[PDB]
């Protein structure tokens, strides 16, 4: 049904801008999984937590 989306703001995920202007608090360091300061460079990707 509603199949349409505008530029999704990376970092927070909001159709309206990108990651250069978005820095909300809810932000998530990594993005392939979404967690916090941690990033793909050091993302555990599902661990013992
Ligand atoms: Zn945003
Ligand atoms: Zn991550």
From Swiss-Prot:
Ranges annotated as spanning the membrane: none
Mapped zinc finger ranges (CCHC-type): 7-24, 28-45
Domain of life: Viruses
Coiled-coil ranges from the UniProt annotation: none
Intracellular or extracellular location(s): Virion
Summary of the function given for this chain in its UniProt record: Encapsulates and protects viral dimeric unspliced genomic RNA (gRNA). Binds these RNAs through its zinc fingers. Acts as a nucleic acid chaperone which is involved in rearangement of nucleic acid secondary structure during gRNA retrotranscription. Also facilitates template switch leading to recombination. As part of the polyprotein, participates in gRNA dimerization, packaging, tRNA incorporation and virion assembly.
Subunit structure of this chain's protein: Interacts with host NUP98.
Name of the protein in question: Nucleocapsid protein p7
Residues of the full protein shown: 384 to 432 of 522
């Amino acid at each position: 049904a509603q199949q349409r989306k505008v530029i999704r703001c990376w970092n927070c995920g909001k159709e309206g801008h990108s990651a250069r202007q978005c820095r909300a608090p809810r932000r998530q360091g990594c993005w392939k999984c979404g967690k916090t300061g941690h990033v793909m460079a050091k993302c555990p990707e599902r661990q013992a937590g």
